[PDB]
Short mmCIF file of C-alpha atoms in Angstrom, two decimals:
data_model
loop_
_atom_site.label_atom_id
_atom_site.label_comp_id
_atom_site.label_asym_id
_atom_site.label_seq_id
_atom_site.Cartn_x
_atom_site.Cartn_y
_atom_site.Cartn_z
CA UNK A 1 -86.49 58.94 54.61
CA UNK A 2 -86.38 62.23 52.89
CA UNK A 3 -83.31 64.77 52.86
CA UNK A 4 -84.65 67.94 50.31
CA UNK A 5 -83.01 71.22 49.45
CA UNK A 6 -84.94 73.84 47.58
CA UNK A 7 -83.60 77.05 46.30
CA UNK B 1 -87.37 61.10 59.10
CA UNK B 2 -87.68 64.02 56.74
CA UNK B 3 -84.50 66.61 56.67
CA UNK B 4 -85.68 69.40 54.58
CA UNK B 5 -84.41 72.78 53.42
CA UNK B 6 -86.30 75.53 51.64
CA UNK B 7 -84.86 78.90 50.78
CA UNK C 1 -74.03 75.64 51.66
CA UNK C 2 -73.88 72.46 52.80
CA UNK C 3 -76.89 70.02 54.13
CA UNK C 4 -75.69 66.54 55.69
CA UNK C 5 -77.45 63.70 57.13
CA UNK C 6 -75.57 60.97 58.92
CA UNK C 7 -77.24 57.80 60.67
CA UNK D 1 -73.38 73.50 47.71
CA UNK D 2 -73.29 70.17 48.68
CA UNK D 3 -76.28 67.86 49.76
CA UNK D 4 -74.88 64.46 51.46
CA UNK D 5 -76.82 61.74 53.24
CA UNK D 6 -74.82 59.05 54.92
CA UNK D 7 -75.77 55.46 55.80
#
């Protein structure tokens, strides 16, 4: 399980 | 399960 | 913003 | 911004 934000 | 997000 | 994962 | 994961 991944949850990723990228900004 | 991947929830991923890019901006 | 707002990223959510429920389970 | 939030980034949650729930479980």
């Amino acid at each position: 399980l991944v949850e990723a934000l990228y900004l």
